[PDB]
Every structure is written in structure tokens, then in C-alpha cells.
């Protein structure tokens, strides 16, 4: 069903996450590309 | 559709905000802000 | 100084957030119209206070009482400054309030609930073809 | 089953309505077209 | 379409014909005159 990273941000039924302490969490946290902070704010709360 | 019409931003008659609000609406329309807002809130949030 | 902006609860124009009870002010709401009000108040330098209309109506003139209700009533009687909401431009409203240019097009539409035979083997050819085949 | 407003107006088993105080109600109220006049009469009655 | 806009009946700024023309356009819109004119001059006259 999913074919890109934007599909994850555009939907709600499927959750997603990453490691608590790792480069991926910081990449999502300090990113400034709209989809990336969107999916960061999703899994922040 | 039974007819064609549209939504508007309403202010009281004689208010000083009418012209600035109309120009703001025009500015948003020409910059594509209204289009991207509609795509964000109608199409991108399809769950079906 | 601060400008009150009346509106109405309607998906996807104004929505309560998931944790709205824990939030105060413009952070409670989300939707198309809150973003529209934010952009409008960013263009013309004002500070706004979103306020859902008390009776939850759009506005109509009572045939006998001759008193408006809803957001049109909010605007006419000085209890609001701007109505950032899905408010339709109509002749009866245009004579009592000032409408900007349309920010979204629309129309009246009908909503209904959603909703092969035994001889479906006879389908890939037209009825005239079957008649001509028999002839 | 239904494809136009005329089909909705002619039938009787399926009712139809709208908002109490909104632009569609006054659209039907002050419409001078025969089919919309019939629909307004039905909804009022 | 790349964007959404519309045609307007233009008058000089501050002219006394502004509000009456706006109300006339709205009245023609609600009565279906504009839709009828568009059908008459675009579709009913379809030559293909």
C-alpha cells in the first residue's frame, strides 16, 4: 500500500517509529523538510 | 452540482478591515496558498 | 486591539484537536479555516481570537422576528469582526455584511448511501449481434 | 437509483433534507424553477 | 487547470455603479441567468 515516505505522513492507520537513541531519531528531530517534521511531530506524541 | 457559488470572508458593513481582507484573499489566491491548503485538508487526508 | 474572529465547527474547516481540552486559545482548533485566518492575519497585521459561534449556525433572518442568527448575526450586531468560515456568498447576506472575493468554489450536491446476472455469459456481445446471429 | 435532482423530486420512498438555517435552505425556499419549487414544497411539508 | 480565478465586471474605483452592479451580478447568479447564458453560448451551441 505504501510506496514512499510521503505516504507514511499522509495516512493515519499505520504507525511508524525508530530507535530512541540513534541517528535516525535526530535526523527526524532536526529536519526542516516539511514532510519530515510532519512525521517527526507525529511520533513525538 | 445544482448551481455554482463560493465561500467568502465576511466583515460588518463599513468596517475598516474589508479592503485589507479582500487584498489578503487575492494575495493568497495568486500565490497558490489556497490551492495547497485545499490539497492538504481534502485530498492528502483521504483514508479510503 | 485584539480582533475577535467568529467561526463554526465543521470538518475540515475547524476541528477540535486531539488534546484540545489541555490547550487554550487558537491552539485548540485545526482545519482549513484556522490556517486561512492565520494567513489572513499574517498579511494584514492583526492579532485574532478565534471564537466558535454560540448557536452553531451559519446565519438566517427570522421571517417574523426579523433578527439574524449565526455568524451573520454575530457580524451585524458588532459581536464579531471577521468571519473566517465556510460562509456562502448570497444576496440576502451581501445586503447586511461585506463579503470578500470567494476563496473556495462549491455547489449544492446530493448525498446518498453507497449502493452480474445469471445470463452474464451473454454480455460480451450486443443484443443486436445475438439477434443477427440467430437470423 | 438516483442520478439527478429531478429523479429525487419525482420519487417518494426516499426523503431528502438540508440544514435548517443555511444557504441551501434559502436556495430552495426562493427558487423559481419548477423542480426546485416541488422539492421545496416537499421539504416544507 | 494550473489555477482557479474568475471574470469580473470592472468599474472605476469609487464609482457610483459599483454596489448596484455587484448586486445585479449576484441576482443574476442566484436566478440561474449566468448558468443559462453559459449553456446557451457554449454547450447548446456545440458544433462538434
Swiss-Prot record, chains A, D:
Compartment(s): Cell membrane; Postsynaptic cell membrane; Postsynaptic density membrane
Other facts noted in the record for this chain: The postsynaptic actions of Glu are mediated by a variety of receptors that are named according to their selective agonists. This receptor binds AMPA (quisqualate) > glutamate > kainate.
The protein, known as: Glutamate receptor 3
Family listed: Belongs to the glutamate-gated ion channel (TC 1.A.10.1) family. GRIA3 subfamily.
Job description of the protein: Ionotropic glutamate receptor that functions as a ligand-gated cation channel, gated by L-glutamate and glutamatergic agonists such as alpha-amino-3-hydroxy-5-methyl-4-isoxazolepropionic acid (AMPA), quisqualic acid, and kainic acid. L-glutamate acts as an excitatory neurotransmitter at many synapses in the central nervous system and plays an important role in fast excitatory synaptic transmission by inducing long-term potentiation.
Residue span relative to the full protein: 658 to 702 of 888
Subunit (UniProt): Homotetramer or heterotetramer of pore-forming glutamate receptor subunits. Tetramers may be formed by the dimerization of dimers. Interacts with PICK1, GRIP1 and GRIP2. Found in a complex with GRIA1, GRIA2, GRIA4, CNIH2, CNIH3, CACNG2, CACNG3, CACNG4, CACNG5, CACNG7 and CACNG8. Interacts with CACNG5. Found in a complex with GRIA1, GRIA2, GRIA4, DLG4, CACNG8 and CNIH2.
Annotated binding of L-glutamate, by residue: 23-24
Swiss-Prot record, chain C:
Function comment: Ionotropic glutamate receptor that functions as a ligand-gated cation channel, gated by L-glutamate and glutamatergic agonists such as alpha-amino-3-hydroxy-5-methyl-4-isoxazolepropionic acid (AMPA), quisqualic acid, and kainic acid. L-glutamate acts as an excitatory neurotransmitter at many synapses in the central nervous system and plays an important role in fast excitatory synaptic transmission by inducing long-term potentiation.
Similarity remark: Belongs to the glutamate-gated ion channel (TC 1.A.10.1) family. GRIA3 subfamily.
Protein name (database record): Glutamate receptor 3
Subunit structure: Homotetramer or heterotetramer of pore-forming glutamate receptor subunits. Tetramers may be formed by the dimerization of dimers. Interacts with PICK1, GRIP1 and GRIP2. Found in a complex with GRIA1, GRIA2, GRIA4, CNIH2, CNIH3, CACNG2, CACNG3, CACNG4, CACNG5, CACNG7 and CACNG8. Interacts with CACNG5. Found in a complex with GRIA1, GRIA2, GRIA4, DLG4, CACNG8 and CNIH2.
Misc. comment: The postsynaptic actions of Glu are mediated by a variety of receptors that are named according to their selective agonists. This receptor binds AMPA (quisqualate) > glutamate > kainate.
UniProt: L-glutamate binding residues: 86, 88, 93
Residues of the full protein shown: 417 to 555 of 888
Compartments, as annotated in UniProt: Cell membrane; Postsynaptic cell membrane; Postsynaptic density membrane
Amino acid at each position: 500500500p505504501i510506496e514512499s515516505a510521503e505516504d507514511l505522513a499522509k495516512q493515519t492507520e499505520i504507525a511508524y517509529g525508530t530507535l530512541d537513541s540513534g541517528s535516525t531519531k535526530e535526523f527526524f528531530r532536526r529536519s526542516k523538510i516539511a514532510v519530515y517534521e510532519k512525521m517527526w511531530s507525529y511520533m513525538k506524541s | 452540482n445544482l448551481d455554482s457559488k463560493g465561500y467568502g470572508v465576511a466583515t460588518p458593513k463599513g468596517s475598516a478591515l474589508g479592503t485589507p481582507v479582500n487584498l489578503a484573499v487575492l494575495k493568497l489566491s495568486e500565490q497558490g496558498i489556497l490551492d495547497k491548503l485545499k490539497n492538504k485538508w481534502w485530498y492528502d487526508k483521504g483514508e479510503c | 486591539r485584539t480582533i475577535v474572529v467568529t467561526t463554526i465547527l465543521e470538518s475540515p474547516y475547524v476541528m477540535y484537536k486531539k488534546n484540545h481540552e489541555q490547550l487554550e486559545g487558537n491552539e485548540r482548533y485545526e482545519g482549513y479555516c484556522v490556517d486561512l485566518a492565520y494567513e489572513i492575519a499574517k498579511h494584514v497585521r492583526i492579532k485574532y481570537k478565534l471564537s466558535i459561534v454560540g448557536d452553531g449556525k451559519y446565519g438566517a433572518r427570522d421571517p417574523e422576528t426579523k433578527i439574524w442568527n449565526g455568524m451573520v448575526g454575530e457580524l451585524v450586531y458588532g459581536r464579531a469582526d471577521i468571519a473566517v468560515a465556510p460562509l456562502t456568498i448570497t444576496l440576502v447576506r451581501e445586503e447586511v455584511i461585506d463579503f470578500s472575493k470567494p476563496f473556495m468554489s462549491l455547489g449544492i450536491s446530493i448525498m446518498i448511501k453507497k449502493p452480474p446476472g445469471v445470463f452474464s455469459f451473454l454480455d460480451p456481445l450486443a443484443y443486436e449481434i445475438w439477434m443477427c446471429i440467430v437470423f
